[PDB]
Amino acid sequence: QLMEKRMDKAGQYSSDLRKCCEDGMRDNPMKFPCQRRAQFILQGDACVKAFLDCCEYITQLRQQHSRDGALDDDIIPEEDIISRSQFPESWLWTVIEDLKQADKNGISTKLMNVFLKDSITTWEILAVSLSDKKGICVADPYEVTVMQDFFIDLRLPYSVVRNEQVEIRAILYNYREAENLKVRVELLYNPAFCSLATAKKRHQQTITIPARSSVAVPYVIVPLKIGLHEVEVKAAVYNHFISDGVKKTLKVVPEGVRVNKTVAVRTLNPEHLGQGGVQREEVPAADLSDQVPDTESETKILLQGTPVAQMTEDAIDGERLKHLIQTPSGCGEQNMIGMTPTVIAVHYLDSTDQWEKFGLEKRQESLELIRKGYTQQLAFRQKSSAYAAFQYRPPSTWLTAYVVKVFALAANLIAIDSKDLCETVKWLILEKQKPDGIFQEDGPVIHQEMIGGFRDTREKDVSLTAFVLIALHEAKDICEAQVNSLGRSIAKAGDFLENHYRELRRPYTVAIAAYALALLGKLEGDRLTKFLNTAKEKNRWEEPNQKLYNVEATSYALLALLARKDYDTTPPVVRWLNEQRYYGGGYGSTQATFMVFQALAQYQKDVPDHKELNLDVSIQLPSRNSAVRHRILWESASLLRSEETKENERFTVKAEGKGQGTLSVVTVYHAKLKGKVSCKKFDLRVSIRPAPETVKKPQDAKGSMILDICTKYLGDQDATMSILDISMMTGFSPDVEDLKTLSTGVDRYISKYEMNRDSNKNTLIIYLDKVSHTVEDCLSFKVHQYFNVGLIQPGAVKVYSYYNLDETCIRFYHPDKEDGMLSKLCHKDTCRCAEENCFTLEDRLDKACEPGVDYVYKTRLIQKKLEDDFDEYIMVIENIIKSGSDEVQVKQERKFISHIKCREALKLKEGAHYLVWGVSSDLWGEKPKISYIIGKDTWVELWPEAEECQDEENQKQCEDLANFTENMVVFGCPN
Amino acid sequence: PMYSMITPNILRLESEETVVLEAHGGQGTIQVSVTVHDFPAKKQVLSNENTQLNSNNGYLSTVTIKIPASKELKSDKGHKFVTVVATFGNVQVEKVVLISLQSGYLFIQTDKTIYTPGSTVLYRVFTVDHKLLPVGQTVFITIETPDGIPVKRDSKSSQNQFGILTLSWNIPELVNMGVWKIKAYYEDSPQQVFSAEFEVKEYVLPSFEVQLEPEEKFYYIDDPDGLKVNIIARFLYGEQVDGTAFVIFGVQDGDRRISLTHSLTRVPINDGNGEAILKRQVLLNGVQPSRADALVGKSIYVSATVILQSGSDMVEAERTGIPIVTSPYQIHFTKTPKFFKPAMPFDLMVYVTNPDGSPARHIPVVTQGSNVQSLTQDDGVAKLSINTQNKRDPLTITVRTKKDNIPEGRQATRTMQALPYNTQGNSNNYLHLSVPRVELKPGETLNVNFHLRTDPGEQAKIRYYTYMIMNKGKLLKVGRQYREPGQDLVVLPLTITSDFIPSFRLVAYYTLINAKGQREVVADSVWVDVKDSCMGTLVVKNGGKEEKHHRPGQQITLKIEADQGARVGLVAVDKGVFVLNKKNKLTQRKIWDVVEKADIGCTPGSGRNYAGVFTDAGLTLKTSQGLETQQRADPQCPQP
């Protein structure tokens, strides 16, 4: 009765206006009112008016049928429907040529033993022959049906956390229609796990699966180690030879978020930066104040012979190409990582004749990468040969220009469709160029620097007209005879930037318009002196509160100076751009990385003063007795040499010789939650709560929750292109139908969503067109828990601007303390097996004098700090029984840290006294503040108070503790 | 005596073509020389062969010529010709023939017809010549987007792989979705582009599949109860579905989707079964003209969103193309000849189809007026032999289906018109080749009936019939079938070998001197199907015991039987893709569909005159008395 009037109202509208009305009648998960959902509509006023009419229709009609319903709405017909498309991959892709053995008829026979795959399906083997005397012949199909009747499915998470506790299901299927199956199922022992299966006793269960049915068998597993660990479950059918085993790898990600940290980037040039020909650089130790307990750090020192040596060697390698950029791809500009660094690395090694170092195939392997990125970038090509950043968005003039620029460069290396390229060019001249030379942006704005801000109508469209003009100048020769308007449009854009150059004030806009004029030879006169005087300290074109945008501006400026053949002015600009590697030793975003690679390779292209390279670099680590030495010459194989250390120490790099080079120091560690409290330019609020019981949940989903994420930008304009990086908790995965509703509609709230594989935890990436600087932008969707987890570790939502990674803010989310989500899922022995990591008079003297025991204290617990990952126990040392490596005093506070497993193992009381001794490897941090680790070689014993020692049950223990204290100070340990 | 020369009307360059030479009434030994010259100058003898005509070969011999592909013949401006000259002692016979080098066939097989992003397209290109024998040439292979942009252009030589170009391509994760095209052409012939297409859709993982099975495979527009559609929902692992289906119907108006909003019903699904009925009053009112006749020629689509009972997953499916007609059959006269012979039976070949185009099997068809009744076979074709009268009037034939439980207003009915053969000088000298309809396999023997009808003074002058067998546009077998005086029926037995697949034409004739002293030629032809088999042999069987169900990871032994020296390309595909998009998958019928388009005949038999029989079947004639055929310019045949 409710789907009835919903389609009669939608029948009132026709063509594309009906899609606006039907989207007005859909449910919205945040429950925005109909006027708020209208604010996200990008189609124009006719679509909004049809949206509001149909939205407020069934809003008041549902509230009328609910207020008289005392006395599902599953209408998504689609009319398209996506059918089954995932089938097992084809195999047996061979050609047999050994068929010469003839019979009476000349028929040749081949026997061939092949192994079937694990797919329970009907395989079908197809054959086409070709004979030099008989021609072509296609055989009839031969069907091979694979069916075992009993099969096991092992349900693992994407990832668990070390010392987090999960329930793992093996679902066992039995389809004999009327015959039941009694099966014994066994979980195999793994010493990296902790479960009911031990080394001396297997965990067997005996079940009976009914006919045409399935039975799930749960297994509770605690991972104890970090890394790729296998889960193997075997089961065999009783009184039969039917047996199956399923082995799957359970990735146990380390606890905390993994954070890279650039410690130092330095230019290596002892001719110019050396005193007496000897350059000395001191690299400090990294700030590891927010490190996760019981994880290792790893400092990577990188020496590069040229400042373009990392980016060239990583753009040829296919797996190394994806790790230049620190942001996700999968949208229109961002997908150009498959093309733009590989194009200018091949163009660099073209102009310098350097493929003799690499393999002979290494050019042809890198040519295949640009062909793949051409096929990937063609997915964003719309119907009018224009390019939009997402699949159902209006086309971006900024993007469509940037596709013309990279396709014109790749046309010299790869076969790019010239007709499609110049049809994309012809769309830019005709549809988007104003008659005064201005290129207009009618799609949603992608890059921040494409808006002329406020009551400065000066600098309006100057950065965009320059960006299109650089792109059309790259396709000048390619689309020459194809478009007869390209020569006039390039000149009209060049006249607009030249006439409006005196009005420019921002360093990006001065620099990007200079390179557009330098390609036309029009950076002379007052355009030249304004461009040079804009630069701070004769080496950078920067503006405060800008990072990556400043790197783009200085790269556009370096390309402007190199186009002017100003080779004497460019070496300080080259050295500055060489050391702006703030994000893991690289440049973080895409447009920053593609611009500084182009500008630095252009310097080494036409100033080939690198043939006299003879750089002798020496690194002196304090942890090593001998200083590492490396010599980077011009011919000497790889132009990059690296060193790794596990110690976070300061060290000194000493460089001698000739040439200009790069030092890079990046520390990799796992960071807790304290260092993520800082938020810059963004504002973020995350909250999670259990869903209502009337909510439809999946069949394998045990519970459901509602995740609310609200964000707001703290700038003077809206933040164009931001990303929500949302990690799921262990066992959780988001509702696809909520995210499909938020991404497909005329009231579109999410540009695109994707699940990021090869990551630490299960991460949902949400792409946003904007983040409002006036109103808080909220979105809600459901997440579903798929198995019981004993000690859930919190998730993480990180918002950031895509083009400025400094403008970020991270928040963490965990459910309630009342959820039963912190309660240990183990029983008793499995609990104790998980408490080994947590932690009689001669016994105390021996255990306090074992080789490795550093300190013995009597402490008193003042305060617990129960956090999400670890527990802090602030204790006052009331007596020092054995002095250790940490210089403590009596009644001095010290932090004792144990895992959230050990909250039930220790059962500490606040105010109570304790006898604590541990090892020196469990000391952590640097003085003046050392943190203590309650580890597996740490002793925790309750010391009763002086009123509790008067009881007869405690009097023997207090005499044993007083005899232990006097023996260990007066006599110590035996020699 | 009369000398005759019969060649195919298009001769292929670098090819073995057969010239028929025959001396009607020859005596002694007649030396015949066949010379091929360039057109129109005859400056160069392109081919030169010799034979003799005597009593031992019955004054009938064949000559194989091979015209070389010279640089003058390879010129791309204008259709070229050659001049074939046969010299029967002192009498020369000369005919100008159209030529074409051809030798272009490229077949493309994908491993499957639907793909996800990230999948690997395994594709093979088979490079054969005009005789379908493997050639080693350079092929340019292009993969294009659904918008047509080339993303991969390969060049591979099939000289060392001996004609099986085996390649692969990885689909990227972000890509155009739609119908992709592979294109291939030889290096020396870029204008002969051969293509296969495949589809790229996105990842779909249903927990349960939904099948929409209508009660009939069509909707009767005058059915009072309506169209019942069974909803079969089951899991992919085999179990049944309990829940709730939301079903909506609609009308597909050519290229127009009309959602019937008043047909939206809630149907429970219990043990994987449910039913949604589209009532007739919803169908008439929902379409804007409420006419039963204005719904004929349209189709019903139906969409259904099935939810599990725990609210857990919804999977929606659609069944499109359910036609709203009154007749479930369509009669087609496409496989029948267009010309009949007077006072001799006319072998009418009625092709009956379902409304989706599939052949309608075991359907009884009755001709109106003559009451001949036959059944269709599995190919949808029925044979009805209609006994014609001794008249040269056009024969109007109406065929009607007569299947029980179908009303007479709902029976398929179509009308055609057959035309008579024109004899020389309005004479009664006829020939009819009568062939039984067997699905002819290689190894069966076909008895061909040679029926004579002449005036009683002209009967004794006919001593033999001269027959010619053509297959794949080449003369396959020529012989004579002798005849005693008084034999009005002569039978030639014909063994079908593997060289007759897929189809062959038998053309036969006799000559005589009539009552006016003039040389008369009377001819006839017939087109015969051969069962789609293979010129070679290729079987894949089990090598071990015939196990019905196998286990995962089980080793099996494959027995592969092929010709000597044959190279066999293999692929193991899941069965669920093979059934999905069958129009792009390489089948054995699709080999025989391609060579069936390359033929030099247009009609399935007979003709306007003696020159009408040779020209319609793909031959040409030149005699010493002046009997000849017209010139061929176009290899194709016209259609409106």
Ligand SMILES: *[C@@H]1O[C@H](CO)[C@@H](O[C@@H]2O[C@H](CO)[C@@H](O[C@@H]3O[C@H](CO)[C@@H](O)[C@H](O)[C@@H]3O)[C@H](O)[C@H]2NC(C)=O)[C@H](O)[C@H]1NC(C)=O
């Ligand atoms: C932070 O920066 C580091 C350094 O650039 C990135 O480290 C890279 O991490 C991946 C996976 O952790 C490494 O792949 C592994 O390589 C080893 C061989 O070295 C192989 O045995 C493994 O199976 C795996 O494939 C990669 O080598 C490593 N790169 C370097 C230069 O050390 C890391 O990804 C960055 N983290 C983030 C969050 O950005």
